[PDB]
Design a protein around this nucleic acid. Structure first.
Lengths: 53, 141, 139, 59, 73, 191, 68
RNA sequence: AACGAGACUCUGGCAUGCUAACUAGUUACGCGACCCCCGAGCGGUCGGCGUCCCCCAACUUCUUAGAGGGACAAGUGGCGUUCAGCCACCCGAGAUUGAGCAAUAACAGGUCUGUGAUGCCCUUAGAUGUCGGGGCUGCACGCGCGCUACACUGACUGGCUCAGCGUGUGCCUACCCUACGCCGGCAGGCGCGGGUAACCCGUUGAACCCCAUUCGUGAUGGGGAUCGGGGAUUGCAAUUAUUCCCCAUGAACGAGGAAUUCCCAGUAAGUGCGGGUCAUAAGCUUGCGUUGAUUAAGUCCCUGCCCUUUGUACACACCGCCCG
């Protein structure tokens, strides 16, 4: 078949992935996020936060 | 007297002179080519800057609990003009302060004590308060 | 007092006796203010007086301490040039030789015709810079 | 815990943000008594979702 | 706490009240009532305290009130 | 003296206000004399509250302007201590009486304003408050010393003490007594 | 400034004076504590208001008859 | 009668009252040790300076965070129909400290490149689904947001002295914050140790400011653009210079047209710091401290908005409509 399929991803914006579906572009790490800012908003009601200010 | 009582601008300018009389302080060769910190743009005007800075070294050890080569630099560091970029703080030289403190320790006015830092010898503490009253003897406090 | 002399000529640039010694010397190319406050102290003379108050005996020593800096124990890192390239030594370059040296390195980078010499010959910025909104002479 | 992030997906319109916050609380009661009756009585009689951590010694 | 300046007002405000308290506790009323009239005459926050502290910034400005420039073309 | 502060050396007694009009917005000695000009930072939250604070402090406030000098009130007080010192050596007076004359001589007597008629500029002459006069006179002379020392070898202290002399004795070599008379010359015309 | 009283205050203020006319004084603090016991006002700031208006009404009721 | 307004939530400002603390302090001695007679005295002691010693000491003012209280136009004087309220003053924290939440109806506003949300259409093996290389940085030009400057109220070199909001390895897949010792001018290297964190970094020993030298009205030592050579760090790789450091080179610019933005009290302005993105890297954004003014207590002139009355050939609503 092939002798390659991959090349070093060890750092950068391609070796971390966000939990929408493996979406990116929307660089995220904060306090152990790995969680997408669009959906973070939809989880304002869900637990982690309730808005108070 | 305690060194607290007197002015400190006066303190150093008599303590620097004191040392240079007594043959004290074996100085590094590099002393006429030395910028003295990363945030300067020039060498000092002073030709006896080493004597002056050793004064200020020994004084701070009298007050605070004593700390190493890192902390001395942080006390001395200032503002760095990066030109077109906005100014920021940064630390100065290290290898100068590492020669200062070892030169003092050769005279046994300081010594590596416990709890991660040099502390000033009782012989050192004697000599500070000895000249502290000499300041008040001079002008009149 | 001290009416003896004023403006003078030294190597390749005319230096006034109006200004302080260190700052006067800087006008000569290849010598900045930082380079001069060293060389004066190796020469063991005052920098606290004017350049018109130096004698001929003194300034004769200045240029020697300048042009052989390694032999008067000014460090290698403190020079303009360390291993020029294709000349094999540490060097210190002064006024009219500086320009001659400079023009060589331009010529060299069009000889090989690297990216550098092309950018030079086209009159565009050598280093990583945008030219889209930078320049104008034109508009 | 502060989180200061965009209120608008796919940024357009007037620039707005949103402050969220979580407030944790800690407090601890020090006892000195046999470890048996402590570990017996502690883990029971807790209605809400509130955490407890027992330590062997600290002093 | 504070800067070089605000410390000066703090040490003044404390020593003024310190003196008063010593008379309030070990000496009679009419001693310290007198001293109170003198200080509060040229009140300059010797026996009182400012309630003013910094306001919290909101977005769209570098300051709490000042705003970024607005362009229509 | 033991019950009323000087200035650190300068008497606030033997100081007068030589108008009946402009007193009760110029005061410096009723009990308002203090060792230094500074405040805790109360100066204004009412319209009347502005008036009360000293003239010497007001002068220090309006001295620091134009970007680089804002928020440097301690540097500003250095310039004022030299000012009085230079004024006393130079002419020999209670150097506050100099300043009081300098303020009173620089305040306008009549002023103009705008009025909209026919979409074209017309002007109308009107009068001026005592509180306006004081505010204007403090502004004008401080602009002089700021202007002069912008390329002169002379320091701002020297420039400012010169500017209070030529105001205190009118002579039209100051930026103030010039600019005062310009306004009044307009106010005569359109009236 | 501003701070013109709303209708929620003026509705209950009238009621509380009608059915507990006797308990009232003309001091702020006494009329507060009465309103705290004869009813519950679910806020603290709201309580401090309703007392003050109850006080201000009771001044006028000791003159001619109120029409509210 | 209902929704919005208000009420409400958070935050700031008032507690020598209450609650309780070696992962927080203070005071008190017990102290013994160091220090100088520096003051009475002699060096001891008494007093002064911090640190170790501190307890089975005492306390909770300071620090921390919980339960409570306090402010209501409450009192007084004017004014108002004497109603609803408004103005001044006493007490004092004055009835506005700043934010969060926010109606009906609408827009052919933005987003199919947040979405394993989704219709329809297209494409689907010579693929619009994978590796290697290049580009999004390419310039005779036009515009916007900002940063740094044009000096003496300054720059430069020494000396003194103050802070706060936070954050940190054991996480993503290979990675943190750093004290201390040693080596180097510097970037940096190297050896050891702590930190799950009011425990270690950090009593965050920051800048402006403050104090003393030097420069002298000079495109000057102001300004640091452009540009040559050399040294380090990150990475698999640094060329079209990743970033950082050293020496040299030394431009425009000497207060800015027509126009125009933003701001009312710890506010504007000056000044530094933390977080975000981050293998390496903020001139950006988001928060925080520090220094801290001048001017107003108004008005409908301009720009715009709310309510009533009036006129209309308008309703795709004056950016409208319409005439020769």
């Amino acid at each position: 078949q092939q002798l390659y399929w991959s090349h070093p991803r060890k750092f950068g914006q391609g070796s971390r992935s966000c939990r929408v579906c493996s979406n990116r572009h929307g660089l995220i790490r904060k306090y152990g996020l790995n969680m997408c800012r669009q959906c973070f908003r939809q989880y304002a009601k869900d637990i982690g936060f309730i808005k108070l200010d | 007297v305690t060194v607290k009582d007197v002015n400190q601008q006066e303190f150093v300018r008599a303590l620097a002179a004191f040392l240079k009389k007594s043959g004290k302080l074996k100085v590094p060769e590099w002393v006429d080519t030395v910028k003295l910190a990363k945030h300067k743009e020039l060498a000092p005007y002073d030709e006896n800057w080493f004597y002056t800075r050793a004064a200020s070294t020994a004084r701070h050890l009298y007050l605070r609990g004593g700390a190493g080569v890192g902390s001395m630099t942080k006390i001395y560091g200032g503002r760095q003009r990066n030109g077109v970029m906005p100014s920021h703080f940064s630390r100065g030289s290290k290898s100068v302060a590492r020669r200062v403190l070892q030169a003092l320790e050769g005279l046994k006015m300081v010594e590596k004590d416990q709890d991660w830092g040099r502390k000033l010898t009782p012989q050192g503490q004697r000599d500070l308060d000895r000249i502290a009253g000499q300041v008040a003897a001079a002008k009149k406090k | 007092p001290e009416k003896f002399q004023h403006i003078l000529r030294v190597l390749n640039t005319n230096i006034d006796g109006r200004r302080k010694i260190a700052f006067a010397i800087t006008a000569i190319k290849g010598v900045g203010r930082r380079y001069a406050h060293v060389v004066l102290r190796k020469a063991d003379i005052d920098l606290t007086k004017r350049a018109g108050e130096l004698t001929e005996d003194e300034v004769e020593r200045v240029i020697t301490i300048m042009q052989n800096p390694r032999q008067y124990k000014i460090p290698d890192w403190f020079l303009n040039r360390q291993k020029d390239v294709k000349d094999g030594k540490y060097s210190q370059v002064l006024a009219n030789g500086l320009d001659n040296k400079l023009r060589e390195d331009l010529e060299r980078l069009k000889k090989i015709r690297a990216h550098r010499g092309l950018r030079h010959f086209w009159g565009l910025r050598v280093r990583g810079q945008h030219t889209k909104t930078t320049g104008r002479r034109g508009r | 815990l502060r989180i200061t992030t965009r209120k608008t997906p796919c940024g357009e319109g007037s620039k707005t943000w949103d402050r969220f916050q979580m407030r944790i609380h800690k407090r601890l009661i020090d006892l000195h008594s046999p470890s048996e009756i402590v570990k017996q009585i502690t883990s029971i009689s807790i209605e809400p979702g509130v955490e407890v951590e027992v330590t062997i010694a600290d002093a | 706490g504070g800067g070089h300046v605000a410390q000066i007002y703090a040490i003044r405000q404390s020593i003024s009240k310190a003196l008063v308290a010593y008379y309030q506790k070990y000496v009679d009323e009419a001693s310290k009532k007198e001293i109170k009239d003198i200080l509060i005459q040229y009140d300059r926050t010797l026996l009182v305290a400012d309630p003013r502290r910094c306001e919290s910034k909101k977005f769209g400005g570098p300051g709490a009130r000042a705003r970024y420039q607005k362009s229509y073309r | 003296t033991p019950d009323i502060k000087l200035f650190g050396k300068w008497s606030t007694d033997d100081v007068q206000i030589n108008d009946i009009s402009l007193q009760d917005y110029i005061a410096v000695k009723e009990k308002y004399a203090k060792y230094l000009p500074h405040s805790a930072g109360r100066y204004a939250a009412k319209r009347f509250r502005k008036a009360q604070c000293p003239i010497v402090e007001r002068l220090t406030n309006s001295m620091m302007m134009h970007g680089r000098n804002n928020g440097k009130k301690l540097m500003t007080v250095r310039i004022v201590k030299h000012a009085f010192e230079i004024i006393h050596l130079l002419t020999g007076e209670n150097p506050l009486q100099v300043l009081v004359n300098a303020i009173i001589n620089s305040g306008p007597r009549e002023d103009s304003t705008r009025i909209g008629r026919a979409g074209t500029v017309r002007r109308q002459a009107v009068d001026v408050s005592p509180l306006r006069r004081v505010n204007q006179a403090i502004w004008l002379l401080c602009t002089g010393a700021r202007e002069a020392a912008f390329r002169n070898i002379k320091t701002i202290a020297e420039c400012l003490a010169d500017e209070l002399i030529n105001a205190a004795k009118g002579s039209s070599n100051s930026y103030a007594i010039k600019k005062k008379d310009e306004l009044e010359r307009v106010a005569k015309s359109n009236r | 400034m501003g701070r013109v009283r709303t209708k929620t205050v003026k509705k209950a203020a009238r009621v509380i004076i009608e059915k507990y006319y006797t308990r009232l004084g003309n001091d702020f603090h006494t009329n507060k504590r009465v309103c705290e016991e004869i009813a519950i006002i679910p806020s603290k700031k709201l309580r401090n208001k309703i007392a003050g208006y109850v006080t201000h009404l009771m001044k006028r009721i000791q003159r001619g008859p109120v029409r509210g």
